[PDB]
Amino acid sequence: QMQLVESGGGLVQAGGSLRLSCAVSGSIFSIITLAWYRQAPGKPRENVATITRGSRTSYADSVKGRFCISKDNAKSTVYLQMNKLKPEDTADYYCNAEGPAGYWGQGTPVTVS
Amino acid sequence: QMQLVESGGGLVQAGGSLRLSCAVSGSIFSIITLAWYRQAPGKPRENVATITRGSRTSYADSVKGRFCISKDNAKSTVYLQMNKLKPEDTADYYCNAEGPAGYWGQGTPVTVS
Amino acid sequence: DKDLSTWQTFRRLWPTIAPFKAGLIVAGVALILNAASDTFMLSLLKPLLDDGFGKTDRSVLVWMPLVVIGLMILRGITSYVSSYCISWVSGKVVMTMRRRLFGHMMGMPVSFFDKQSTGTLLSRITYDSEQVASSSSGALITVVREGASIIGLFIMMFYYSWQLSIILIVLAPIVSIAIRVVSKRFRNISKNMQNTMGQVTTSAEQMLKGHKEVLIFGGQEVETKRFDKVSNRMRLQGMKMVSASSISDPIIQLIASLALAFVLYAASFPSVMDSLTAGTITVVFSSMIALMRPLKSLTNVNAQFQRGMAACQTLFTILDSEQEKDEGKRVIERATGDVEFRNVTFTYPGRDVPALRNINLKIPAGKTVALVGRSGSGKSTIASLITRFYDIDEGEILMDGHDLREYTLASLRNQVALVSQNVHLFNDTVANNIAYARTEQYSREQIEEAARMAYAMDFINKMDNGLDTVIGENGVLLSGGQRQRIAIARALLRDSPILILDEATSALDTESERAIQAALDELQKNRTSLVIAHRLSTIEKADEIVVVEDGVIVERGTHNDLLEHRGVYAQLHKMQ
Amino acid sequence: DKDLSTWQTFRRLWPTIAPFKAGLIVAGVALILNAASDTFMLSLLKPLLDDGFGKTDRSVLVWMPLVVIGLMILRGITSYVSSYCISWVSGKVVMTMRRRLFGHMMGMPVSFFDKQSTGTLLSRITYDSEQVASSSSGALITVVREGASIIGLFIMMFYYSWQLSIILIVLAPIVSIAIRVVSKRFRNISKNMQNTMGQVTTSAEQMLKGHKEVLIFGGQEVETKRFDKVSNRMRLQGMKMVSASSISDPIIQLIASLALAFVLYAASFPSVMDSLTAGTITVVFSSMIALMRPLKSLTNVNAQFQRGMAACQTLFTILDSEQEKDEGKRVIERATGDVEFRNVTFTYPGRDVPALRNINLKIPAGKTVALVGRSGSGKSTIASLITRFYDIDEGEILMDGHDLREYTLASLRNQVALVSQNVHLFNDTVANNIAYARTEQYSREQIEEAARMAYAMDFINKMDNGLDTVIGENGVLLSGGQRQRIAIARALLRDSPILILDEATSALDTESERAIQAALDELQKNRTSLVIAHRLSTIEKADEIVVVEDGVIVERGTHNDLLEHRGVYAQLHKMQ
Ligand SMILES: *[C@@H]1CC(=O)N(CC/N=C2/CN3CCN4CCN(CCN(CC3)CC(=O)OO2)CC(=O)OOC(=O)C4)C1=O
Ligand SMILES: *[C@H]1CC(=O)N(CC/N=C2/CN3CCN4CCN(CCN(CC3)CC(=O)OO2)CC(=O)OOC(=O)C4)C1=O
Ligand SMILES: CCCCCCCCCCCCO[C@@H]1O[C@H](CO)[C@@H](O[C@H]2O[C@H](CO)[C@@H](O)[C@H](O)[C@H]2O)[C@H](O)[C@H]1O
Ligand SMILES: CCCCCCCCCCCCO[C@@H]1O[C@H](CO)[C@@H](O[C@H]2O[C@H](CO)[C@@H](O)[C@H](O)[C@H]2O)[C@H](O)[C@H]1O
Ligand SMILES: Nc1ncnc2c1ncn2[C@@H]1O[C@H](COP(=O)(O)OP(=O)(O)NP(=O)(O)O)[C@@H](O)[C@H]1O
Ligand SMILES: Nc1ncnc2c1ncn2[C@@H]1O[C@H](COP(=O)(O)OP(=O)(O)NP(=O)(O)O)[C@@H](O)[C@H]1O
Ligand SMILES: [Mg+2]
Ligand SMILES: [Mg+2]
Question: Where are its TM segments located (chains C, D)?
């Protein structure tokens, strides 16, 4: 069965940079759709970035121009590069595989001072 | 061949009422689409009213709520009832059968004081 | 099926057999020699008995074995020659009839095929032509061989003692009328069996072509019950044939043996005996006995031979049906593409309600006309009238200023390339489907360019052999969109001046449809085109959009003008 | 294939013939009596000649005519009985074989029909079974009827003078080995002719089913050249058969006439004569002469009999092919509809590339799953796996918690109603198409309600007879949308727990599609459904949308969630 584990960061300062990873296993990695969701303490899950088979990345308007999602086919890993973080970005981040009704990650908290 | 002749009015006063007619001949009158166009002295032809097989009328916005297009199947005639005329409505009026690339009428000038 | 006698069907067949007269002539000569050998062999009892084995000189028995062996060599050679030549002529005639039947079916109107079943026509090709073949080879060889033997025996009997050939004469007409009655019966039964075999073929073909529906809807019992009926009916009609044959043969045998009874009774008289020895009388009795055996062969093969005669009569009736009415006589090298409907009204055969009513439609050269409308409104019917699948009632359809009926059908249909609503592909390679009827004329670079314009090259490169991949019976080894794109490439390969796309992109997704549209825009910028579409995204750039409703044109215009004027098309656009 | 023998094919046939032993037994008895009558009639020369017509008392000739007439009555009655009974048994056996062949073809896997042609199987039904029928009736009656005659003549000859039955004995094995050699040759040629006839049927069937393409693309010359080839090959193989037969018959006749030469030579000796009269030999040389005529009949009918023996061998080889694998044995009355794909991987036969790769798809009970994706991505393949048209390689497809292979095929396919991408209708009244395999179970009110839910009632009311209107061979007398709506009504009539719509609305306009969707929403609120769609307006309310790409699921979700997440589906929605 497809499983995926994030290896992300913890607490960072405002305006800093973070890079999350999520190794995807047991999948046809070059075809399926991968995405990054985040969940604020009160708000529901929100989509942040999506990448498709052609590496066609799409970014949520609330975060566009600051994040960057990419995937390494050889390592079977999808990366989320964050730049110029804000306190409003402090949330729990999940990687997702093939759709909102697909497979989810355990979560990785991210805190911005 | 399908031919159609308007029998309309001439000069009327502002706020008056007029009723145009256009007898359509040589056609499957109950199915085809009939419409009324008008042409201001400088402006190009503009659609004013359209009626379809189900007597589905639909007016232009510039004239909606004042005109009324209807057709009599037995007499094979389509009527345009005008109410609350304005000087801006002074134009040459044409009846049209089955589309802007269909058959046109000779025209009937209408003048509003 | 109005019946002809055996002589009349041979008089109809003769123009086909005339080119092969030489085989018939040598076969007839060899038949004569074979009958002579048989009769001469049988007439060896008279010297063997009269010139007794020990009563007279053995000079006869000195040489008789060599005479028998020599007669057998001669008989064998002539038997081979006659059998082979008649079978060669028969095979040639049956091949010619099969080819004529195939060409005739290929030349029939489309309305003919609408009302028929593939099983009936397939049975005409397979079962009836095989009946002609089997009869005219086996039963005909036997019938002529036994007829020659009978005539030889008659001649010998009349030669030795005509006072008994008189009873032969008085009995021959009775046998003739009996055989003539039974033969008419056989031909009737055979025509019934041909119809039943058409029904059997239709049943099996319906099961085969609709196999997945049979499986999914559990129609096994219904199909089995249908086939049980038709196959039992086929068996019962075969039994009718057998009953007629096996009641006819003993009656004729009894009539013929009345002659043997007469000969024994006449020899019982003392006034006839002492005129001839134990010799001629032994030969006469042996001749009657040996005559009763060719009669039996003749009647059995008459049963099997009237089946071929009935099949020939059926094929003759078919081969003078009316084909597609082609009375135009001006070829066109390449039409400009200016097609014009002029007040045409069309009613499908046997329908009493017009499918089209008063169509005044101009399709200028180099311009694209899009037909849109509800389902069942008459768009595919306009497309079918342009290609002359059906002929109109009133009005004229002109191409290049002349009525469509003035042109040759081949010349006219050379100007049209059509992607039909129901795509049909052939069981061949992909390249022989794109270049279907012109495999000698189009190179592989042209075929690959067509397949690239139809957006079919990406999925073709992934197949097992590329353009040499065999697709299934109806392209069944392809997905629905892939069959559609192969049909599009087939039409686009031929740079026909008129291109008709009858919902060519129904099974395609949007990106595939847009790629094909991009190819069409550049390729067909100067060719008359007629696009029949349900998706208005396909026809937004057409030079004229025509909305058909219940068979009449309800409005016409360009996309921007029809969006104003808020007519039917504005409603279709809004709800989409 | 592997030839067998005549005896071995009769040993394979015997279990089919066993239920009809009574006809065979009475036919055998009547055959014995017929042979006895023939031989007795021929043995009348000895008293007629020895007890001379005038040399001795006429007491013989007083009664002999009545004896001849009585023997003829008896022979006629027994001939009728034997012919009729053998033909009845043969017709019954051929009917049984035809029914077994039809049932066998109906039970084959779909992958079998993908690789075949309708013409080959149709030829198996029509041509081969007609060969068996013709042989086993006509040629078999003649073979038995001459074999009995030959045996009677042998017995009589050995009875009158065994010193010449010795030459008969020394010549019989040579004739046997010659006939056996020629028969093997005939069986080979016949199997070749069966294959060629399959090719002829395929050629004609391809022209007939693709007639419109032949016309539009001008394929008349190519079709004519392909039929010329196959029909000439059929003629040439028939000529091969004739060559073998007509070279075999004279050789056997010559071998048999060596016996006649021997008898004349032996009688030429003085040490053999004076032991017997003129009349005993009057029987013996009359009997050799009359023996050479049944030999010809037997050899001449051998090719026709071997055309039936070869067809029987072919049918036997077919009737033990592998049918659809059905080794499940649990029926299901009504599935809940919970279908689950569990890591399934599927490769089409002979394709070496997976059509589906790792499909983990749950279709819960009462929920609708929509499969969308580009053309050629594997949606119709998922639909074909649910109904077990093809069997998977890895993984399991479960229905109600049990693997699909655990259920009976009939029981499983009773749970699924399918509107396939390529609609196939029948040559039946609209009402017998909507209720295809259940015409006895659904009332006309149920059929009208289905037709109303499929939005087909308005166009049906306008037809000639309403629900009793005959549609064409494949619904050809309908427009494309009307055929689609009749297929939709056919599926909706049966309230199946699983409904699969494989692009059921491709030929429909938007208003028609929306009316059908409105009917589906209310009717199928609690039934498992799988909609395969290219138009995303059709599937906006599906409980789960599944995007397939190159055979793998690339994302899954609801419409609102998939519009966010900006994946493949957001792109498809944007471009539409
Ligand atoms: C045709 C000529 C015209 O005047 N049109 C628009 C007029 N709109 C009316 C509003 N109407 C709403 C209910 N209509 C259906 C019943 N109509 C009678 C009631 N009408 C007042 C309320 C009286 C009118 O003559 O028109 O008023 C009868 C009718 O079909 O005429 O929007 C409408 O039409 C619906 C035209 O389209
Ligand atoms: C992936 C991660 C990221 O930062 N994304 C958006 C960044 N947008 C960039 C604008 N870029 C326009 C030309 N790009 C194509 C060449 N890119 C190099 C030039 N980039 C500056 C102008 C440098 C960047 O790293 O990104 O900048 C290379 C590239 O593929 O990265 O909009 C864009 O991406 C096009 C993401 O989508
Ligand atoms: C399917 C069987 C294939 C092989 C069949 C082999 C048997 C063929 C021989 C059949 C008997 C001969 O058949 C006979 O031929 C003569 C000419 O010779 C034809 O007669 C022809 O000339 C006659 C006499 O001027 C005219 O009426 C006319 O020009 C034409 O019919 C007969 O119409 C035909 O009945
Ligand atoms: C094709 C249509 C034919 C329909 C009419 C056929 C007429 C002739 C049919 C009979 C042919 C000879 O019939 C012969 O019968 C015997 C009867 O035990 C069969 O013998 C059979 O029974 C034995 C004993 O149970 C079994 O080992 C086995 O089933 C088989 O050998 C012969 O194998 C068959 O050849
Ligand atoms: N061969 C035929 N014989 C008789 N009637 C036919 C035949 N083909 C079509 N019709 C009918 O003729 C009318 C015109 O339909 P047709 O021209 O096929 O449709 P269409 O407008 O192309 N619709 P659609 O195929 O759904 O896009 C409809 O009533 C058809 O059912
Ligand atoms: N019977 C078959 N044998 C071999 N290959 C097949 C067969 N049917 C389909 N394919 C191929 O299998 C793949 C999956 O196609 P299929 O399941 O038919 O597609 P789809 O996604 O429904 N296509 P479409 O109708 O065009 O949208 C494609 O490459 C087909 O060409
Ligand atoms: Mg159509
Ligand atoms: Mg498909």
Answer: 60-80, 137-159, 164-183, 250-270, 272-292
Query: Residues 88..107 of C with a Cβ closer than 8 Å to D: which?
Result: 88, 91-92, 94-95, 98-99, 102-103, 105-106
| Residue ranges around ligand 6 (CB below 6 Å) | C 476-482, 507; D 114, 348, 351, 355, 373, 375-381, 421
Q: Number of folded domains in chain C?
A: 2
Q: C552: which chain B residues are within 8 Å (Cβ-Cβ)?
A: 28, 31-32
What resolution in angstrom units was achieved for this structure? 2.8
Q: How far is the CA of C424 from the centre of ligand 6 (A)?
A: 17
Rounded-to-integer distance, Cα C318 and Cα C124, Å: 9
D310 and D379 belong to one structural domain: no
Task: Collect all residues with Cβ–Cβ distance below 8 Å to B37 and sequence separation of at least 6.
Answer: B45, B46, B47, B48, B93, B94, B95, B96
What determination technique applies here? cryo-EM
For residue D553, which of C511, A101, A98 has the smallest C-alpha distance? Answer: A98
**Amino acid identity for residue A38 in this structure:** R
D-facing residues of C in 150-189 (CB < 8 A) are none
Which residues lie closer than 8 Å to B39 by C-beta, 6 or more apart? B45, B46, B91, B92, B93, B94, B107
In a domain, C30, yes or no: yes
Q: Which domain holds residue D158?
A: 6-319
Place of tokens 């593409």: C337
C203 and C118 in contact (C-beta within 8 Å)? no
Residue carrying the six token digits 């092919």? D321
- State the chains in contact with D (3 or more Cβ–Cβ pairs under 8 Å): A, C
Give the closest residue to C373 by CA, choosing from C541, C487, C520, C539. Answer: C539
3-state SS string for chain A: CCEEEECCCCEECCCCEEEEEEEEECCCCCCCCEEEEEECCCCCCEEEEEECCCCCCEECCCCCCCEEEEEECCCCEEEEEEECCCHHHCEEEEEEECCCCCEECCCEEEEEC
Question: Quick one: fold of A3-112?
Answer: Immunoglobulin-like (2.60.40)
* Same domain, yes or no: C134 and C204: yes
> Nearest Cβ partner of C552 from B32, B56, B58?
B32
Q: Is D378 annotated as a binding residue?
A: yes
Minimal Cα–Cα distance from D218 to chain C, Å? 7
Q: Is the CB of C355 under 6 A from ligand 5?
A: yes
Q: How far apart are CA B47 and CA B38, in angstroms?
A: 7
What residues contact D331, with CB distance under 8 A and at least 6 apart?
D407, D408, D411
Nearest-angstrom CA–CA distance, C81 and C512: 67
If asked whether residues C313 and C344 sit together in one domain, one would say no
- How far apart, in whole angstroms, are the C-alpha atoms of residue D132 and residue C111? 37
Q: Do D557 and A47 touch (CB under 8 A)?
A: no
Asked if C358 and C421 sit in the same domain, the reply is yes
CA distance C512 to D547: 16
Distance CA D127, CA C123 (A): 10
Q: How far is CA C565 from the centre of its chain?
A: 56
Name the residue in chain D with its Cα closest to that of C70.
D254
